[PDB]
């Protein structure tokens, strides 16, 4: 059992200790489509250095979670190759931005399950015993079995890493928080298409006594786990 | 009977090129004393009520336009069962830390408890018969409610969002609806937050990647479209 | 106090070998005039109310035992918003075809509408403060409600089911809970149906494949385990 | 291109008076060796496979008719992630009690595990590209899946149900769909159960209260309505 994390705006978690038997690290969408050359985000013309800066810090947190025996869950955003799970508005916006879901680029069909751009990057590769969530939306709970995996393991606390801070990570945090999960978001293990959106996404969590949970740097988590 | 697109950011809304009132709902989120009035939850935490109240008059004019065109209208209230059976202990603990514990007695009764004066919808945007009210225990209006059943029964595909706050309840509801494939518009002058920088960032987040959560617009741009049949 | 297993079909319930009141809820499903009283929905369709009412007094004895042991108690009411925004058109059409249209005026007010006399919980099993009531628009108590939030907030893992009808609202709620991993017991003498053969078949369906939906028991065997 | 009602119990189905293939899906539930073939889960528990297999050839004729009319077709497989992360401990314990533990090795590989021979859809009703397959960890096809997203994206309002077993996976899926407002038909000769009395009672339960869960029909009456 571990102590609290020095976090914003309260010492996390609210109940005063971290139990690996009730805590999961979530790694959200570390895929070429969100952080690598030739994928979805690169094809739209965004700066990949903003999404990639969280990769090596995430690998150090993943190693700490594995050493403490906490649950580890990974997510991949993606669609059935027949696109039966693709809403027409999501498709139309991706075409408007110059990177249509299902269209072929340097890393295969954009955001399609089984394609090279959709795979988890090797810097944070999963291992046996770490379930992978395949989500068709931004939030990892909707149209998945994530809540069943968490409730079966008795998980009450989540530590969030991955990309992007303001889209998939924030949506997943908001979904978990409404169900009563106690959530921490790591500031140096997340990133966005705009630095001001990354910073605003983190400061939004801290209002009203910690409306969505708390924020911390990975250094503050690693100090609590040591 | 069908209306043109809205001049919106970052695309002319909606994506399918017209607004049909038979398939469109206006959502009014949490226009309650607890979020925008003296003596409630937000006031007791020490935030500036002028930031949350400025969207009330514009919302009333959009509500009038929705009623005139025969759109669906749905209202939401955040709040808890008086026995607090729907209150997660972390939500309760943070509200106490912020100096406004849910269920504690203040100037407007028990904070965020269903049936209390602070929890009522303010009269400037009072519901009418035929405009369902959602009682939500969380920030998103879909979780632990019948909202998705009400929308699917009426054949709703498109949502127009107003209410408070931009970055918490409104954004959570927009993200939930968007993942299910609803086409959503958020009105910039009919929403507000505890911090102006968070209000502005919440709107600009919508506009990335071709409109990742939908589009943004001023109520003037919506009212112009609702005076232009095609 | 922690209690031993219940003599149940097809295994001594529950699977994990003890009953902890801190993690167990008694659910009372739809004990309303619309399902078990004169002038309501079920009476207006022409079904025999003695089939649905026989479980009322046994349910009151189990409710007393649940309150004595400090277990969670949750009640359900099936019903609709007065504006009928939560009423699917197929559910409405079938209720009209059966001679008891939802929302139509009958001897106990508008049929299956929230706030109407026929919709109230009957006094034999009146709720107490601290026993949450679920308002469900469907047969299953989880769909379009906050039930799963109430159960997870209290740390509930085990459910004991009573109420009506065995084959419709009770079975649908049991199937929904079971898929989420809740461990469920259905009481044979505290439930009932519009047809006795459907009541008996609904109970036997639970018992297949090692207890596919949980187990069945008589209230006497639950009260024996609780030492009442 | 729009079809008339099916002669069904207890009303001519559907309630709105016609069948539009653009808004209708045929669901094939759990036609797997684990539920209907030698060496699988149901066989290892000692139940009579002739009761679950009798609906296979009628189902194949209905699948051919659905393909000809351009209806949506959706298939389901019950089963678990190979790491068993989606397996509740009560489900596991009961399967061991019944002598067929989920994840244990039997004649067709690991019982109810995704990717194993006993878990595959049997060839008589093999899926085709553009007929989505649901992998469900529970009895109801909606819980912990993307089924509701697939149906709402296609504009589906009406469901025709086939598969096994009548009283477990088929009934649970019918009850879940009905509460959301889907209009459902269950085919009596394209379903089956571990007990014939449970099959018959599961069909009769649908028919009460003016059709509380929908209606029942024979394949013959559906194929007559489709022409």
Numbering used by the authors:
A (entry chain A): 2 to 227
B (entry chain D): 1 to 230
C (entry chain C): 1 to 228
D (entry chain B): 1 to 227
What text does the study give?
Biuret hydrolase (BiuH) hydrolyzes biuret to allophanate and is part of the Isochorismatase-like hydrolase (IHL) protein family within the cysteine hydrolase superfamily. TrtA is a member of the isochorismatase-like hydrolase (IHL) protein family, similarly to BiuH, and has a catalytic efficiency (kcat/KM) of 6 x 105 M−1s−1, a KM for triuret of 20 μM, and exquisite substrate specificity. TrtA and BiuH are members of the IHL protein family that possess the catalytic triad comprised of a cysteine, aspartate, and lysine residue. Interestingly, the active sites of TrtA and BiuH are almost identical in sequence, and so it was hypothesized that triuret is the substrate for TrtA, funneling into biuret metabolism.
